[PDB]
Design a protein around this nucleic acid. Structure first.
Ligand SMILES: Nc1ncnc2c1ncn2[C@@H]1O[C@H](COP(=O)(O)OP(=O)(O)OP(=O)(O)O)[C@@H](O)[C@H]1O
Ligand SMILES: Nc1ncnc2c1ncn2[C@@H]1O[C@H](COP(=O)(O)OP(=O)(O)OP(=O)(O)O)[C@@H](O)[C@H]1O
Ligand SMILES: Nc1ncnc2c1ncn2[C@@H]1O[C@H](COP(=O)(O)OP(=O)(O)OP(=O)(O)O)[C@@H](O)[C@H]1O
Lengths: 130, 597, 594, 221, 162, 112
DNA sequence: GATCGATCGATAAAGTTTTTTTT
DNA sequence: ATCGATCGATC
């Protein structure tokens, strides 16, 4: 259970002494799903000091809260925070000195890389006053 | 297999029909002049055995190479070393499923098609005989790669501690074949509901390449094998045609037999050609005698003089029509398209006039530019046809001025600046300012501003709308004959078979009589046109005293000397005469007084 | 190499009679290189073996050079290098060949390929339009051990030996040879060579129109680099060669060609159809043909032998084409030492006929046709990555116009882009741009030839003679001569016209082009204190008779009135400004202004 | 316009490169059937399924409906039921979609096999409805009306390439519609633009163009 | 001038005039190194090669190696000197150029303390020594034996400067 | 994304000598007012909204329209902006030409 | 059963002049 | 061409 932010390979504790971590087969039958979307937000008009490139961030809607967020309106959110990296996986090969903190983050137990950490945000419940 | 081979060296040296013994008697006749090729004609092959055909028509690639090796051995025998391998050319005529069977059963099966080739590519090289060296022990082998499943039929092995891939491709003892990657387009009349057509890809061999120019109908026989290129989801592949024999129609580079000109010389001895073509060109056109004479001289042309200094004379003519609707100015133009050797039909809107001449683009390999398209690069020797010279107001005028009168364009765009050759001949048909009221007012206002386009053309007809209450009923008698009952399919087979000329014989005919005789007008005939011209300018200036302005200049005068050169190409006489030249001005003097009215 | 060397050995004793006439030539070219350089207070190693002298008395040694030219060239090098030191060694670079002669039907136009003479000799002509970079490349470095003080020696082969199929050495600096010495390398004692990739088009006149011009490419070496300008009728001949691995590489090379056709060649020859040599005989005839007092009038009508009259025009072209000098001001802006004439005419009066026969006698002046594209005098940062990671400003049409002439058509029938383009490049000799790269002030000495048509038909007499076509008068001010071609009807004129179009369906040109390209390199008088006096009287009257007549003039028109007479004395080939030059310059303007 | 009936499926490839790699999965809709655009979506049991399959109960019936004596006086009266009006338009507009024949010929000029009516009406009679009603009763149609009809977008046009592609040919209205319906009333500002591109769909019938592309000729009767 | 410097002028000393363009900034280059293990304190030294290099292991020293516990290496800035560096490109005088081709650029470097003494627009000349450098990237499918050289500066002789 | 510029962000308190006043006027004609309009040389792009100084004199030579400027005709037939001329400038000059017998031959001697 | 050594496989590339409708 | 990971062999 509990596939993490990159755990596309459940490879722990087989029943018999078979070849553990040898393969997998993502069954579309029993593994129940849920539906989501990824939208961007923006800061309200009555708080900007000047035209000073008003920054933003990104959210994730998880439950039934999909499609309740009509785009282009003043809106409120739940408030759980999160940080999500994704640089090393099975498929595709993974300016300034952005990600300079990442050099500290090296040398995990798997292969030596430069793993970053970017701030993001998760929601649970939406409301739209106005 | 070897057994199968034993069954072809023992077959292509004694197959015959009744005492002609043909296949030895052309293989010898193809080893003297260097061609190294066969024409099996598979429908004529079947006389041995249906089984040996059926080991061919059900399985591929293996059969072609075994047959090729057998032919090479027989060729080697007919001699007593410089002996190359041969190539095959097969041909049949079953029927052409046009572009509909795609995947069902026609994968690696013999097939016959029909299309129009539009796009050639530059040549290339693949190898066929190699000599391979190893790094570690200086081993030496030789591997031949004949037929294909494109490359990667077999790869270089590992055999000769010893490191893998130890082998290299030297270039000192090798041979090479060229491929094409020319692209076939569907003949645009036989997939009709509402859809755009599609396209395929095809390669070939050296001794049957460079036999096509774009703009022709071709029939083609070959294989439907499948390659796989890794520069899309499921593990897919792509289709292409390995081709064998382009036994198409004529070229439409003047090599042909002798009996094709035998009847042509037997026809040209009859001095009735000029009056009979005016009937025999357009079998569904009510008369229009003055215009019909102008089309046969446009298709033939004059000459090209590169006289001993730098300049040259533009030896061709360019007619122009205009007139009321409903008077055959448009439907006549599809008729000249099929009869021409090379003909292009871009007759609408001008089609973004900068794109008429040449175009560049970013090209996906190497991110570069070169020159690809144009409506004038492909139409050399032949004739283009366009219309609607009123409501192309943007840039049609600036795109034909350099294109005409010197035929030497040069593209000044981001890459090359080259003067590519052109020998084109233009043709157009337009509308005046709604026809009728233009011919009931001051007789200008035809082209609204410029006379400078009219001075580049020379020959101009002006049709009109009379009310002759006698001949029109014969025209109303004429259209009901052709339109239903179709008796002209039976009338023009019971008056044509001894008198008239069919529509496809002229396409055979014009390409021969142009490319042989280089004519010249009579030198004592120069007194005639000089005495003719001096009153025409007097006939001009008698009108300008009436507060009348506009167009006649000297360029039409050096067009009449091309007009009298035109019928000399028809009669194929190297000298001209005076019965010749007086009929030519008889055509132009019926378009001299048009400037008055 | 025992059996593959005896015929190489037999050639070494054979062809020593073939350079009975060149064994002087091989040593005489280098004894002054041993004397120029030793006494400073320069030539490559080029040994032109004629094909005749080898064909004249050898067959088997001759036949291999046009069938299998892959075993036979480093023979002729190997004899040639030991016949240089054995000639001259006492004073304390392999002398490769050039190989000129005839060939016997190997003039393969590269629209056609070979099917039989792959990997053989081939003569190829055409025009080049690519002109890629220049970059050095090693052949051999010399390693050195600092400890124990002894050197080493290593050669690295590439696709430049042209004939042998060497095992490649893809190493850059093999360090730490079988010792314990930290290796060094004297790079001054190393040796280097350069490459240049150039693609050649087809000469687009003898290729019959069924295709666009194709192209192949050629890799040459150090002797003939920077020799070919883009736009030269070049002639080259070298070996034919394929390289690269293709079709049988490790996996999945389906329907991919793998044989890059290349040419490793020699002897790049310009042609002319600057090289015009002339003896004492023909150089004295033009001195004898500088003698008469009529040669400006004879040369005028001996130019275009098809069109009547326009002797004001026919003198103007030859006056312009030879051109005038520009004395550049020391620490000052030079003025417009070029000359830029213009024509306009009511249509079909041969106003465009005479613009293209100047291109046959152009003397390396290739013009465009004026198509509505930006690139007339710029690049717009076309780089094509210059083989993966380099940016170059490839010149459009001003690398060719330098000390030459151009001609373009349909001035009024253009968009606004060329109007600002010919603005700067006329008042200023050069152009400078940082499109996506760097500013660069590349120079160009050029001169235009114009052509345009009036819009409103036959209206050049009933309206203003000025403001007549309304293209911006900045260009009209920057040009001088605006000829208005008349075509009025005279009954003897057109009668004479009617026969001269009939007698053209059947003192000379190459003597004419030799005359100007010899008179472009002689003296320039500029000075006569009284010929300058008559012209200012010849101007100030019409300076007071400019508004009382049709056209107003400006002050820069005075710089025309010296410049026409300056080149008019160049027709005389004299170091003195005479008096008679100030009469042709008068009435030529008097026809252009009345 | 199409609408598709099939199954839903998933393919968790475990690799996506627009967003980051994440515990997500793509979408693939395989199909079992496909039908054409439908019209007047108000039915309950018919005219949504393209049956058009005149097998037994129709073809055995449809002969005796053809051997009567006043059918052409009955069909055109009963064609457009909602509008009583003057007779002659319903004679013409029924004749228009019935069509003639593209009778080919030997190696000579082809013959137009089309009939092209033109209505003229007062502003307030039923002329805008018969054209609206005949759009349903045809098999295929188009309704490019009024302003906004481009001078090129009716016929074929070239859409430029995406980031690694070639200049391909993507036609618009007239190549799709075999029996199309336009409304050329008086869009006068664009009347001098488009009307040079529709009056050669009839005259030089099967017109196609070569603006900066390939010289081809599509066939649209 | 740069139009004729193609040949035997590698590894030599040649002065060339020109026009200085594309002045970069001053960046610290590396000449010595000192990794710290925080156990034995033996700061390891090494020479600096071209523009890319690689650190070493931690079980290599003489005290903090060779035991069951090893001092894990990491760097330190101030235990190593750092030099100056600035890059510039040259063009031609627009009068020694021939009638044909466009001018050709070149790369130059600086060392020692000649830095911060050039300007964009300086009609100057540099005197310096010659060296080609390898590319060390994509060595098989490109850059077989190519050079893409530069020149190394020694002296600048600038001119025309109540 | 460095802050490259033209003249007025680097020619502060100096001389800005311009030519060709009828060239690229869709951006020029506003900005030349903005130095005579006091202290608004700025970069009001999407990047930032910072404003630097403006202290430079202007010397302008507006070339006339077609032909000679007809002196019998009205002025402001070849000048573009009247609002700059009325109060945003102070004084004008002119370079008329009259055919003169005495002066132009000296002017001919001035150039010969 | 664990550790070390050897062999095999996978990893690094780059853009910005012509042409369409539109205001 | 270099680095990392996996597999096989030896202690
Ligand atoms: N002179 C003629 N002889 C025979 N048939 C003719 C003639 N003129 C017109 N036609 C007939 O007219 C029919 C249709 O022509 P179409 O409708 O293309 O004319 P159109 O293009 O309007 O005329 P125009 O070319 O003057 O505009 C053709 O089938 C053709 O047979
Ligand atoms: N004034 C003339 N005298 C003699 N021949 C002439 C004259 N005008 C035209 N010609 C003949 O016309 C032919 C070509 O004329 P050309 O095409 O150059 O006209 P043009 O200058 O192109 O006119 P435009 O530029 O207005 O199209 C030449 O072969 C030439 O013999
Ligand atoms: N003869 C008629 N029978 C039944 N209804 C009619 C009749 N004439 C008009 N109508 C009704 O009048 C309404 C108005 O539409 P109408 O057909 O008048 O538009 P129109 O005037 O044809 O428009 P346009 O002039 O733009 O084509 C229609 O909905 C239609 O139902």
């Amino acid at each position: 259970v509990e596939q993490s932010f990159k755990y596309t390979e459940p490879t722990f504790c087989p029943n018999p002494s078979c070849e553990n971590r040898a393969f997998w087969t993502l069954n579309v039958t029993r593994s129940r799903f849920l539906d989501w979307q990824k939208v961007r937000i923006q800061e309200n008009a009555n708080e900007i000091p000047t035209g000073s490139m008003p920054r933003t961030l990104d959210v994730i809607l998880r439950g039934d809260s999909v499609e309740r967020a009509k785009p282009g309106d003043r809106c409120k959110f739940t408030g759980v925070e999160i940080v999500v990296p994704d640089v090393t996986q099975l498929g595709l090969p993974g300016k300034t000195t952005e990600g300079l903190n990442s050099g500290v983050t090296g040398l995990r137990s798997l292969g030596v890389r430069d793993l970053t950490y970017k701030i993001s945000f998760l929601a649970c419940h939406v409301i739209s006053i106005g | 297999n070897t057994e199968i081979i034993k069954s072809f060296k023992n077959f292509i040296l004694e197959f015959r029909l009744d005492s002609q013994f043909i296949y030895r008697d052309q293989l010898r006749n193809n080893i003297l002049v260097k061609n190294y090729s066969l024409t099996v004609n598979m429908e004529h092959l079947i006389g041995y055995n249906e089984d040996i055909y059926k080991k061919l028509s059900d399985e591929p690639s293996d059969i072609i190479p075994l047959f090729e090796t057998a032919i090479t051995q027989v060729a080697k025998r007919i001699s007593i070393n410089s002996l190359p391998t041969f190539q095959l050319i097969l041909n049949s005529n079953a029927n052409q499923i046009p572009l509909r069977d795609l995947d069902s059963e026609h994968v690696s099966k013999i097939v016959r098609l029909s299309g129009i080739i539009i796009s050639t590519s530059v040549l290339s090289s693949r190898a066929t005989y190699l000599s391979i060296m190893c790094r570690n022990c200086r081993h030496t082998t030789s591997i031949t790669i004949n037929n294909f499943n494109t490359g990667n039929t077999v790869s270089l092995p590992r055999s000769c501690n010893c490191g893998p891939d130890p082998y290299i491709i030297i270039h000192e003892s090798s041979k090479f074949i060229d491929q094409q990657f020319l692209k076939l387009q569907e003949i645009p009349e036989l997939v009709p509901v509402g859809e755009m057509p599609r396209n395929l890809t095809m390669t070939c061999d050296r001794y049957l390449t460079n036999k096509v120019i774009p703009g022709t109908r071709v029939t083609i026989v070959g294989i439907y094998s499948i390659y796989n290129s890794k520069n899309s989801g499921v593990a897919i592949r792509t289709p292409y045609i390995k081709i064998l024999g382009i036994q198409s129609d004529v070229e439409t580079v003047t090599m042909f037999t002798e009996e094709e000109e035998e009847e042509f010389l037997q026809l040209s001895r009859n001095p009735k050609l000029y009056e009979i073509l005016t009937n025999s060109i357009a079998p569904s056109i009510f008369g229009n005698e003055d215009i019909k004479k102008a089309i046969v001289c446009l298709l033939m042309g004059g000459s090209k003089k590169i006289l001993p200094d730098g300049m040259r004379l533009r030896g061709d003519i360019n007619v122009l029509l205009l007139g009321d609707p409903g008077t055959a100015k448009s439907q006549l133009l599809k008729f000249v398209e099929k009869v021409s050797p090379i003909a292009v039909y871009t007759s609408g809107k001008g089609s973004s006039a900068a794109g008429l001449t040449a175009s560049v683009q970013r090209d996906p390999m190497t991110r570069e530019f070169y020159l690809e398209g144009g409506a004038m690069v492909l139409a050399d020797g032949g004739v283009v046809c366009i219309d609607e010279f009123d409501k192309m107001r943007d840039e049609d005028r600036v795109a034909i001025h350099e294109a005409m009168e010197q035929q030497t364009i040069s593209i000044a765009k981001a890459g090359i600046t080259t003067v590519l050759n052109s020998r084109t001949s233009v043709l157009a048909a337009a509308n005046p300012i709604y026809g009728r009221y233009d011919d009931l007012k001051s007789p200008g206002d035809n082209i609204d501003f410029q006379t400078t386009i009219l001075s580049r053309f020379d020959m101009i007809f002006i049709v009109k709308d009379d009310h002759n209450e006698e001949r029109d009923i014969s025209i109303a008698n004429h259209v009901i004959n052709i339109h239903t009952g179709n008796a002209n399919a039976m009338q023009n087979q019971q008056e044509e078979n001894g008198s008239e000329i069919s529509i496809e014989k002229m396409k055979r005919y014009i390409t021969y009589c142009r490319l042989k005789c280089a004519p010249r007008l009579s030198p004592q005939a120069a007194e005639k046109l000089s005495s003719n011209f001096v009153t025409i300018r007097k006939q001009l200036l008698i009108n300008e005293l009436e507060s009348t302005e506009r167009p006649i200049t000297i360029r039409q005068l050096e067009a009449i000397i091309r007009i009298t050169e035109s019928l000399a190409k028809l009669e194929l006489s190297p000298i001209a005469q005076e019965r010749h030249v007086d009929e030519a001005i008889r055509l132009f003097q019926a378009s001299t007084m048009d400037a008055a009215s | 190499p025992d059996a593959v060397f005896g015929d190489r050995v037999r050639r070494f004793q054979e062809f020593l009679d073939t350079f009975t006439s060149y064994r002087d030539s091989v040593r005489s070219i280098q004894v002054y290189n041993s004397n120029n350089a030793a006494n400073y207070n320069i030539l490559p190693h080029r040994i032109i073996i004629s094909l005749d002298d080898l064909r004249e008395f050898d067959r088997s040694f001759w036949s291999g050079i046009l069938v299998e030219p892959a075993y036979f060239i480093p023979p002729a090098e190997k004899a040639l290098t030991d016949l240089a030191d054995s000639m001259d060694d006492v004073p304390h670079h392999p002398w490769k060949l050039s190989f000129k002669g005839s060939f016997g039907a190997h003039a393969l136009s590269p629209r056609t390929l070979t099917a039989q003479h792959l990997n053989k000799l081939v003569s190829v002509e055409g025009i080049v339009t690519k002109t890629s970079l220049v970059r050095p490349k090693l052949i051999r470095s010399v390693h050195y051990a600092a400890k124990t003080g002894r050197f080493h020696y290593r050669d690295y082969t590439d696709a430049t030996t042209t004939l042998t199929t060497r095992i490649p050495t893809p190493a850059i600096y093999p360090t730490e040879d079988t010792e314990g010495n930290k290796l060094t390398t004297e790079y001054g004692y190393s040796t280097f060579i350069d490459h240049q990739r150039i693609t050649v088009q087809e000469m687009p006149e003898m290729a019959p129109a069924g295709q666009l011009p194709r192209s192949i490419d050629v890799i040459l070496d150090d002797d003939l680099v920077d020799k070919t300008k883009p736009g030269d009728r070049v002639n080259v001949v070298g070996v034919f060669k394929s390289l690269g691995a293709g079709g049988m590489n490790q996996s999945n090379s389906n329907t991919l060609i793998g044989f890059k056709t290349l040419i490793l060649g020699n002897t790049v020859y310009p042609l002319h159809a600057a090289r015009q040599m002339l003896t004492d005989f023909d150089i004295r005839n033009i001195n004898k043909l500088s003698k008469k007092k009529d040669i400006f009038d004879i040369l005028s009508q001996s130019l275009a032998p098809s069109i009547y009259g326009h002797d004001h025009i026919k003198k103007a072209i030859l006056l312009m084409l030879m051109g005038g000098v520009e004395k550049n001001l020391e620490n000052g802006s030079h003025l417009r030492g070029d000359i830029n004439i213009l024509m306009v005419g009511d249509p079909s009066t041969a106003k465009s006929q005479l613009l293209r026969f100047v291109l046959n006698t152009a003397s390396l002046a290739i013009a465009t046709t004026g198509r509505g594209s930006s690139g007339v005098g710029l690049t717009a940062a076309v780089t094509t990555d210059r083989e993966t990671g380099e940016r170059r400003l490839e010149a459009g049409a001003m690398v060719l116009a330098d000390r030459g002439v151009v001609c373009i058509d349909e001035f009024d029938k253009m968009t606004d882009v060329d109007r600002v383009a010919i603005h700067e490049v006329m008042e200023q000799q050069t152009v400078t741009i940082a499109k996506a790269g760097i500013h660069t002030t590349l120079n160009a000495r050029c001169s235009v030839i114009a052509a345009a048509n009036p819009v409103f038909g036959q209206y050049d007499v009933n309206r203003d003679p000025h403001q007549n076509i309304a293209l911006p008068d900045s260009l009209l001010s920057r040009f001088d001569l605006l000829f208005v071609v008349t075509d009025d009807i005279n009954e003897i004129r057109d009668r004479s016209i009617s026969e001269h179009v009939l007698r053209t369906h059947r003192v000379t040109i190459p003597f004419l082009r030799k005359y100007v390209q010899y008179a472009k390199e002689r003296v320039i008088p500029q000075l006569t204190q009284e010929a300058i006096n008559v012209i200012v009287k010849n101007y100030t009257d019409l300076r007071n008779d400019d508004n009382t007549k049709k056209s107003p003039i400006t002050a820069r028109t005075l710089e025309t009135l010296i410049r026409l007479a300056t080149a008019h004395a160049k027709v005389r080939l004299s170091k003195t400004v005479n008096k008679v030059d100030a009469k042709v310059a008068a009435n030529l303007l008097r026809f252009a202004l009345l | 316009e199409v609408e598709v009936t099939g199954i839903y499926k998933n393919n968790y490839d475990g690799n996506l490169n627009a967003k980051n790699g994440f515990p997500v999965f793509a979408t693939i809709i395989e199909a079992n059937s496909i039908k054409r655009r439908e019209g007047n979506t108000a039915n309950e049991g018919e005219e949504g399924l393209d049956v058009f399959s005149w097998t037994e109960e129709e073809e055995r019936e449809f002969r005796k409906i053809s051997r009567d004596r006043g059918i052409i006086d009955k069909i055109i009266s009963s064609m457009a039921p909602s509008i009583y009006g003057h007779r002659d338009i319903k004679t013409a507009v029924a004749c228009s979609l019935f069509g003639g024949v593209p009778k080919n010929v030997n190696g000579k000029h082809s013959i137009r096999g089309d009939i092209n009516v033109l209505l003229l009406g007062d502003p307030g009679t039923a002329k805008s409805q018969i054209l609206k009603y005949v759009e349903k009763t045809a098999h295929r149609a188009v309704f490019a009306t009024g302003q906004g009809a481009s001078a090129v977008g009716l016929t074929a046009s070239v859409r430029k390439d995406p980031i690694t592609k070639e200049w391909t040919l993507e036609g618009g209205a007239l190549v799709l519609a075999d029996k199309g319906v336009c409304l050329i009333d008086e869009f006068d500002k664009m009347n001098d633009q488009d009307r040079t591109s529709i009056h050669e769909a009839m005259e030089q019938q099967s017109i196609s163009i070569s603006k900066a592309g390939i010289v081809t000729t599509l066939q649209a009767r | 001038s740069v139009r004729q410097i193609k040949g035997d002028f590698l590894g030599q000393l040649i002065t060339v005039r020109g026009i200085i363009t594309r002045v970069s900034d001053v960046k610290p280059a590396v000449e010595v190194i000192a990794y710290t293990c925080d156990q034995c304190g033996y700061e390891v030294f090494q020479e600096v090669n071209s523009r890319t290099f690689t650190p070493l292991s931690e079980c290599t020293s003489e005290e903090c190696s060779q035991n069951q516990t090893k001092g894990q290496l990491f760097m330190s800035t101030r235990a190593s000197k750092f030099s100056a560096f600035q890059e510039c490109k040259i063009q031609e005088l627009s009068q020694q150029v021939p009638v044909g081709h466009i001018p050709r650029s070149l790369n130059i470097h600086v060392n020692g303390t000649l830095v911060r003494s050039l300007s964009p627009g300086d009609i100057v000349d540099v005197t310096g020594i010659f060296l080609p450098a390898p590319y060390t990237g994509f060595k098989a499918l490109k850059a077989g034996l190519l050079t893409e050289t530069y020149l190394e500066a020694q002296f600048v002789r600038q001119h025309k400067k109540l | 994304m460095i802050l490259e510029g033209g003249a007025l962000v680097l020619a502060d308190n100096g001389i800005c000598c311009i030519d060709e006043f009828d060239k690229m006027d869709e951006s020029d004609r506003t900005a030349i007012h903005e130095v005579m309009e006091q202290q608004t040389i700025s970069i009001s792009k999407a990047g930032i909204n910072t404003t630097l100084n403006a202290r430079t004199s202007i010397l302008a030579a507006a070339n006339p329209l077609y032909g000679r400027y007809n002196p019998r005709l009205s002025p402001l037939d070849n000048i573009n902006l009247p609002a700059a001329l009325l109060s945003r400038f102070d004084i004008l000059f002119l370079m008329l030409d009259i055919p003169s017998r005495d002066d132009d031959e000296k002017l001919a001697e001035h150039v010969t």
